[PDB]
Amino acid sequence: DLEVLSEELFEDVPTKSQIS
Amino acid sequence: PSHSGAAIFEKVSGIIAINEDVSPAELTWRSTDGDKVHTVVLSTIDKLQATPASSEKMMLRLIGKVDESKKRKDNEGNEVVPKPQRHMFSFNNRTVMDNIKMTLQQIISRYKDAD
């Protein structure tokens, strides 16, 4: 366990309304 | 079950347990050993982030509303612009995240639906 991830393929889940 | 699921917070492995009995709801990641816990206000959560279904990666996160509206200097022409705070949680099972990612959203939608 030294480095086996991927924070580059993360996405955003669908959520009603969009106050961005 | 749906209001609970274990995840990784800051390289640590704990338990993420959602509290839908509140208003706004609330998330709570507690270490497995009981060294620390992180609470989340799904309301304050600017948005909900979670690994896609196409990606075997099992991880969920909640972004926090930032005060970037300021974005200014201090005096030496530097740059402050307060950075955003997001709660990242790495799950060791797409089942947990699948049961969690739905919970948060299940509630979130109620904030907009109730908005």
From Swiss-Prot, chain A:
<protein>
    <recommendedName>
        <fullName>DNA repair protein RAD2</fullName>
    </recommendedName>
</protein>
<comment type="similarity">
    <text>Belongs to the XPG/RAD2 endonuclease family. XPG subfamily.</text>
</comment>
<comment type="function">
    <text>Single-stranded DNA endonuclease involved in excision repair of DNA damaged with UV light, bulky adducts, or cross-linking agents. Essential for the incision step of excision-repair.</text>
</comment>
UniProtKB/Swiss-Prot annotation, chain B:
<comment type="similarity">
    <text>Belongs to the TFB1 family.</text>
</comment>
<feature type="region of interest" description="Disordered">
    <location>
        <begin position="65"/>
        <end position="85"/>
    </location>
</feature>
<feature type="compositionally biased region" description="Basic and acidic residues">
    <location>
        <begin position="65"/>
        <end position="76"/>
    </location>
</feature>
<comment type="subunit">
    <text>Component of the 7-subunit TFIIH core complex composed of XPB/SSL2, XPD/RAD3, SSL1, TFB1, TFB2, TFB4 and TFB5, which is active in NER. The core complex associates with the 3-subunit CTD-kinase module TFIIK composed of CCL1, KIN28 and TFB3 to form the 10-subunit holoenzyme (holo-TFIIH) active in transcription. An additionnal subunit, TFB6, plays a role in the dissociation of the SSL2 helicase from TFIIH after transcription initiation. TFB1 interacts with XPC/RAD4. XPC/RAD4 recruits TFIIH to the NER machinery. Interacts with the NER 3'-endonuclease XPG/RAD2.</text>
</comment>
<comment type="function">
    <text>Component of the general transcription and DNA repair factor IIH (TFIIH) core complex, which is involved in general and transcription-coupled nucleotide excision repair (NER) of damaged DNA and, when complexed to TFIIK, in RNA transcription by RNA polymerase II. In NER, TFIIH acts by opening DNA around the lesion to allow the excision of the damaged oligonucleotide and its replacement by a new DNA fragment. In transcription, TFIIH has an essential role in transcription initiation.</text>
</comment>
<protein>
    <recommendedName>
        <fullName>General transcription and DNA repair factor IIH subunit TFB1</fullName>
    </recommendedName>
</protein>
